[PDB]
Amino acid sequence: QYRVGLLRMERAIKERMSSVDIDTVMPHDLINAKPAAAAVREFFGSSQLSQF
DNA sequence: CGTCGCGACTCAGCGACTCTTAATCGAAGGTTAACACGATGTTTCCCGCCTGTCAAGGGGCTAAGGGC
């Protein structure tokens, strides 16, 4: 599930890096963190394996 | 005196609704251009009309006490 979240984050970073230039760019400014923690939250929030 | 030109034929094949009956505990995670007038509501007081106090005054009715 973290690999799925990382694939989503990679898609987001690929969609966002085309707009923001890489030369003189603020570090880690295009990498998102919502789908990273959202995947583990769903895994521990309402997953069938983490049900109880 | 054979077949094939030309026709149906039923056979396959492909899609598709339910999972008893009561019950063991409540919610549940992300997606990230910038600005501008305008017309459109939102929210405060402010007087208008009116509603509700208790009081003041009084009289009128009821009743109780005293005298013949």
Protein-nucleic contacts, chain A 1-52 to strand B, CB < 7 Å: 8, 12, 16, 32, 34-35, 37-38, 41-42, 45-46, 52
- Whole-Å CA distances, A14 to A17, A19, A36, A45, A48: 5, 10, 15, 28, 31
Look-up of token digits 């929030």: A45
Nucleotide nearest to A45 (CA to C1'): B28
Q: How far is the CA of A27 from the C1' of B31 (A)?
A: 21
- How far apart are alpha carbons A25 and A45 in whole angstroms? 36
Cα distance between residue A47 and residue A27, in whole Å: 34
Distance A23 CA to B27 C1' (A): 46
Strand ranges, E, within chain A: none
CA nearest to A31, candidates A2, A46, A52, A11: A11
A47-A36-A6-A31 Cα dihedral, nearest 10 degrees: 160
Experimental method: cryo-EM
Residue A51 CA to residue A2 CA, distance in Å, equals 18
Q: Dihedral sign, CA of A47, A39, A44, A3?
A: positive
